[PDB]
Amino acid sequence: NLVQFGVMIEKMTGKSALQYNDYGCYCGIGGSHWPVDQTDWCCHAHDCCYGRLEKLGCEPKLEKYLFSVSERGIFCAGRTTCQRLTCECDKRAALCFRRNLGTYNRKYAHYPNKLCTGPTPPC
Ligand SMILES: Cc1c(C(=O)C(N)=O)c2c(OCC(=O)O)cccc2n1Cc1cccc2ccccc12
Ligand SMILES: [Ca+2]
Ligand SMILES: [Cl-]
């Protein structure tokens, strides 16, 4: 489930994984309408990533993988290809979060779902 991804987020962003829970309109379970900012797009893309893995027969919500963080980046591993794929989806998201640290806004943390409006952009 969520333990490894939370650890990855904390390592790459310096924030608790709680700070990306219910962030904007996409971070947290599900999501809909238009992303509020770049961080939120990371989560929209991550949702898309997981949907791709589900079509491949993986269960990314549950897969347990292994990873380390050296200086040259995040190294992903696991017994199965589905575990390694899930790690790749998470990696891209954690890197996306880090890259957009400059526009992270606390006002979007724990965002009320009523404030999510507009169309839902496709994957
Ligand atoms: C950032 C994020 C997520 C995403 O990347 C996203 N795209 O929605 C995420 C998440 O995404 C998958 C989904 O939308 O089904 C589900 C639950 C918590 C999530 N979180 C928050 C979160 C991430 C990692 C570890 C957590 C541990 C405890 C509580 C919340 C945690
Ligand atoms: Ca989501
Ligand atoms: Cl295993």
Domain coordinates of the chain in residue numbers?
1-123
Return d(Cα 115, Cα 4) in angstroms, integer.
30
Does the annotation list 108 as a binding residue? no
Task: Give resolution, Å, one decimal.
Answer: 2.3
User: For a substitution probing ligand 1, which of 3, 8, 21, 50 has the most ligand atoms within 8 Å of its CB?
Assistant: 21
| Whether residue 30 has its Cβ less than 6 Å from ligand 1 | yes
Does the annotation list 50 as a binding residue? no
Q: Is 44 a catalytic residue?
A: no
Q: What share of the chain is helix, strand, coil (3-state, %, to 5)?
A: 50, 5, 45
Listed as own residue / partner, the contacts of 45-48 with beta carbons closer than 8 Å and 24 or more positions apart are: 45/92, 45/93, 45/96, 46/89, 46/90, 46/92, 46/93, 46/96, 47/123, 48/123
Q: How was this structure determined?
A: X-ray
| Whether residue 32 has its Cβ less than 6 Å from ligand 1 | no
Question: Can you count the helices (H) and strands (E) in the chain?
Answer: 3, 2
Q: What angle do CA 77, 78, 80 make, to 5 degrees?
A: 130
Q: Is 33 a catalytic residue?
A: no
Return d(Cα 76, Cα 84) in angstroms, integer.
6
User: Could you tell me the fold of the domain covering 1-123?
Assistant: Phospholipase A2 (1.20.90)
> Which residues is 74 bridged to in the sheet?
69
